[PDB]
Ligand binder design. Structure first.
Ligand SMILES: Nc1c(F)c(=O)[nH]c(=O)n1[C@@H]1O[C@H](COP(=O)(O)O)[C@@H](O)[C@H]1O
Ligand SMILES: Nc1c(F)c(=O)[nH]c(=O)n1[C@@H]1O[C@H](COP(=O)(O)O)[C@@H](O)[C@H]1O
Lengths: 322, 328
């Protein structure tokens, strides 16, 4: 209805942050949650069961509402599903008051087969009920006919607000990701521009055209396609993934595309510098500089307090910049 | 001298299959919603001829997910298992294509995008398709074009190579070539795996980055091919009977010629024949290698949307083989 641009602006006004909470639970995370709950009389699962919107998830809700001691003896084949989903609900419940957006990386939800995709659907359902803007980090790329399937999965099935896209194959893929001609629907995406892996320079900086590094060429082509699609008129956008640890490029991108939406992962687990990243990418509409924090919250044993201190530190830095 | 099904590296598996059936046809299995619905319609209209044939195949008993449902009478599904109907007809469409066409296929390539848009149900189908192909011992590619940082991509490695037991996958290395360390190698288990990295793709605007970007008069696609091979060497893949090869579009005749000229012994996967209208003669000629498992020609919709996929697959197999014989 409102469109992602508007969702972001309105939630920014309500919670006054640009923290994007990453929800990438790994097998160890799920196993640790199960073990801790088991040894703590399921105190967090019990809290989960008291939240109202658990009642609105799509898949196997009745299983999720069962008492953990009954799951383990009467629905044991659903034990992994139940604890994985409950870990996600627990992180969301503990941290959502500090989050402008949640980003879920698809890779974490696929490796067990179908079960994690049901979890992923329920996570999207839950965030939707909470009116929290969402990003599916799936780095999708293919030819037009094929990518329409991702459009359906991400924007119709999950009802995500946005996704990440790798446009190395070409930009025209965005016509079949960010736009549905038959339905007249428009969607938002962040394209990979400068990534956090240690060898990201190999293609992103070392290749060039004219006198511009590849990452600039790619940012500019993504913006040309946004214009072509008239996304911003429809309250949607194509934005950029720029690594936290990539200060020069962040500085360059914010200077040269002054009003672009940036998503910046790499603080916490990957050691990026929060002050420098937020200052180089700063915009007064700070929804345009999403600071993603995943593992530094999810692998923190006190995730509410972890999210709070990122929120508070972001706030202090936002204030310094103005 | 004999190695059992599943106990050899992908280089050896491809080589043996290529010796067996003498082709480089790669059949693509990309079932769309219309395909599944049309299969269900056609089977309902013909008393489920093809499903009953799937049900007599021995290896259907060896698939992992919901065998109880898959092995039911189709009229029982429709009347008593309404919520499993889509799963059943989707999975049976895939088994039908496999059953009708496998004798002509050097490899099957499944594009992950077609298996995700309904949520979990298609991933169960996909897992059964991979289990089925593993039992048939047909070489497999999962076309997922994966890319992420190392910690995250490990999860795709587990899905593709442990859960699906795929032989290979497609990979976009624009983020960096170091992700390959976490895709083609598992340091915990000391296992090696094969992949095809995107080099030149078939989309109409593929030149915009792959050709326009360059370093010192070498275009991006050449740099990216070299970097991938550099990483294959470092990882010792070919000494472990695995490889990193290249996706080069059927319609990219000059780039195919360049790649085969400059990397004489590389493995090439080439989509774009059939529905995308690539030139098969030109593609095969420019990509030719006498070990023709090194020039896989993928055909998807031209087979899977034909009402007689066995005959369509035979026609492409025969056309390819005729062009292979011309080269020699
Ligand atoms: N999409 C990403 C990029 F393009 C990138 O350049 N670097 C990234 O880390 N991510 C993702 O951002 C998240 C980083 O999570 P955390 O380190 O735990 O805080 C993971 O989902 C990564 O896969
Ligand atoms: N992986 C691909 C590439 F890198 C590429 O450059 N072009 C492609 O078509 N594919 C895939 O190859 C198949 C083409 O299928 P068919 O057209 O029905 O014969 C689909 O899965 C495509 O997504």
């Amino acid at each position: 209805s409102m469109g992602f641009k508007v969702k972001l602006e309105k939630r920014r006004n309500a919670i006054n942050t640009c923290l994007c909470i990453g929800l990438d639970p790994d097998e160890k995370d799920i196993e640790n949650f199960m073990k801790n709950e088991k040894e703590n009389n399921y105190n967090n699962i019990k809290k989960n069961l008291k939240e109202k919107y658990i009642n609105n998830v799509s898949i196997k809700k009745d299983i999720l509402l069962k008492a953990p001691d009954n799951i383990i003896r009467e629905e044991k084949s659903e034990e992994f599903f139940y604890f994985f989903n409950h870990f996600c609900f627990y992180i969301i419940n503990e941290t959502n008051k500090y989050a402008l957006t949640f980003k879920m990386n698809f890779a974490f939800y696929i490796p067990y087969g179908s079960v994690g995709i049901d979890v992923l659907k329920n996570v999207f359902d839950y965030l939707y009920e909470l009116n929290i803007p969402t990003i599916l980090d799936m780095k999708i790329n293919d030819i037009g006919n094929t990518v329409k399937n991702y459009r359906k999965f991400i924007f119709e099935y999950l009802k995500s607000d946005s996704c990440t896209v790798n446009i190395y194959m070409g930009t025209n893929m965005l016509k079949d990701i960010c736009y549905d001609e038959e339905k007249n629907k428009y969607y938002s995406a962040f394209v990979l521009v400068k990534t956090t892996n240690p060898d990201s320079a190999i293609f992103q900086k070392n290749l060039s055209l004219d006198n511009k590094q590849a990452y600039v060429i790619m940012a500019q082509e993504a913006l040309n396609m946004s214009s072509y699609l008239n996304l911003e008129q429809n309250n949607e956008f194509i934005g950029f993934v720029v690594g936290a640890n990539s200060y020069d490029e962040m500085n360059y991108i914010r200077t040269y595309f002054p009003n672009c939406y940036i998503l910046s992962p790499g603080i916490g687990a990957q050691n990026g510098d929060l002050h420098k990243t937020l200052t180089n990418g700063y915009h007064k509409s700070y929804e345009k500089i999403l600071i993603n924090i995943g593992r530094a919250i999810t692998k923190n044993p006190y995730p509410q307090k972890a999210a709070q201190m990122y929120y508070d530190q972001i706030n202090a830095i936002l204030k310094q910049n103005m």
